[PDB]
Structure 1
Amino acid sequence: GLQRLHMLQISYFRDPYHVWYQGNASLGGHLTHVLEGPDTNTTIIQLQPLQEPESWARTQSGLQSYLLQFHGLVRLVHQERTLAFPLTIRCFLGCELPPEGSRAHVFFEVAVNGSSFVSFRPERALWQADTQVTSGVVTFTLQQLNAYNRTRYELREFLEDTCVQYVQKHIS
Structure 2
Amino acid sequence: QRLHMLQISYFRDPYHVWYQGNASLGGHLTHVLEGPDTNTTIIQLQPLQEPESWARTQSGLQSYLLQFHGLVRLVHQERTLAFPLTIRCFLGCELPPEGSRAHVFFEVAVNGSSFVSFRPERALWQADTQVTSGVVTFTLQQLNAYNRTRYELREFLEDTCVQYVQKH
Correspondence list, 1:37-56, <5 A: 37-56=35-54
Superposition deviation, residue 99 in structure 1: 1.2
Task: List runs of 5+ in structure 2 lacking aligned partners.
Answer: none
Residue correspondences, number: 168
Superposition deviation, residue 100 in structure 1: 1.2
Runs (4+) of structure 1 moved beyond 3 Å? none
The residue number in structure 2 matching 1:5 is 3
Cα distance in 2 for partners of 1:66, 1:32 equals 19
Cα distance in 2 for partners of 1:4, 1:135 equals 34
Q: Secondary structure at the match of 1:22?
A: strand
The residue number in structure 2 matching 1:98 is 96
After TM superposition, the score normalised by the length of structure 2 is 0.99
Superposition deviation, residue 128 in structure 1: 0.3
Superposition deviation, residue 135 in structure 1: 0.5
Q: Secondary structure at the match of 2:72?
A: helix
Cα distance in 2 for partners of 1:73, 1:157 equals 20
Superposition deviation, residue 15 in structure 1: 0.3
Cα distance in 1 for partners of 2:148, 2:110 equals 22
Superposition deviation, residue 101 in structure 1: 1.0
Superposition deviation, residue 149 in structure 1: 0.3
Correspondence list, 1:1-172, <5 A: 3-170=1-168
- Identity, % of aligned pairs? 100
Cα distance in 1 for partners of 2:12, 2:27 equals 32
Cα distance in 2 for partners of 1:40, 1:157 equals 27
Cα distance in 2 for partners of 1:126, 1:84 equals 26
- Cα deviation per residue 1:108-137 (whole Å; 9 max; x = unaligned)? 000000000000000000000000001000
Superposition deviation, residue 76 in structure 1: 0.4
After TM superposition, the score normalised by the length of structure 1 is 0.97
